[PDB]
């Protein structure tokens, strides 16, 4: 069958279609063991030198409010003039949640300006089966790109969910288990995470956070030697 | 003019002034990742097939980059994305990921008029078929667009040829050629046939 012609018909996304989404989870319970306490911090990251975010990250997952995800924002202008090169460690990896439209070029520029190739393009798909316009755009819009760069030198390159209510723009949990599992190292950074996305490995900064915890040499003491070099998903 | 028509060629030497203007122009080229390099990617004359409409371009690994670039020289802003999630019959999905998907870049040309936007999604679900071969639904994701209108296809194989559309490409059958005026500045350009040089 022909499920664009069946969404012109309906209004059911042929991605509401898709079917079906072994120790395979030692992997996880590695993960977890290995991971640092949440650390947090709120900050208002227009006006906040992320040279005093230290040491350097092996993981950067931005998610920058883009006006878009509703209907402060930030513009790509804003985005790209962030010294994201500052804080990345020299081998690391950038996730740049780029939304449907201009960002998925935009934010190519950014991963280039800080000094990263794409190497994998992510895409959360957006189901709308329990409820069957930018004016650039020439069809609906029912995804939005998770761009993965790599600097220096198991899982698939989709997020199938349900298109959440009308103002949450919380992006799925399901990209922190894709970075997880790829075992990049311990250093990991959430700019512009929420108190709802805190989590266990993870350093969360955002202006919306209303508890902080961070402190720099608390930080860096979890990286000491010997832990300097650990996968995350390695024994403690 | 309405029915299949192509023309086997090398898409890199061929005249493609003599083809007129489409509404659409769609692409699944050799990248370099039978190929064409980066040049004569960037080289080919898009510019001439379109004076307001829209083009479609499949892209694959840098490709994804490389095509923006290609898709902006040729004077296309990209508008927006197809996605193809790839299935088998049971409607299940087929270096650092598993890769369940391929992309398909829009891009814009000057000022279309009365093309039907936002009838379809950008996802498309399809089964896979022999290597290469895109889904057929983008055709009607296309034709509900811009109905009745000229298209061409570059790069398309036998299977690709469609009403409304012309196709160009080195494993095609012939010369398959009906719409008056192309005939026409055909036999003009290419008295005796032949596409060389
Ligand atoms: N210089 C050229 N001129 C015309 N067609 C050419 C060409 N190089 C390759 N092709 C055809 C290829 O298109 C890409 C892909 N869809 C394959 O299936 C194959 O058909």
Redesign the pocket.
Known sequence: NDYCQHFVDTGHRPQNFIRDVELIRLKDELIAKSNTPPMYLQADIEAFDIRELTPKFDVILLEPPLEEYYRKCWTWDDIMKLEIDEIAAPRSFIFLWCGSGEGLDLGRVCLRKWGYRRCEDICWIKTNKNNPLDPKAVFQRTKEHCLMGIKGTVDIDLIITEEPEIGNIEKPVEIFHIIEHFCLGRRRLHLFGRDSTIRPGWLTVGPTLTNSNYNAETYASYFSAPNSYLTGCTEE | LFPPQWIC??????DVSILGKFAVVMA???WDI???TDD?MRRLNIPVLQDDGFLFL?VTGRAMELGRECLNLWGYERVDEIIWVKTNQLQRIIHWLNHGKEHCLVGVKGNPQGFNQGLDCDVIVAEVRST???PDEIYGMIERLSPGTRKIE????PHNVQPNWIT????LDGIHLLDPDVVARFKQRYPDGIISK
């Open positions: 060629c090398d898409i890199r030497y061929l699944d080229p050799p039978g190929t064409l004569e499949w290469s071969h895109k570059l790069f398309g194989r160009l490409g080195n494993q």
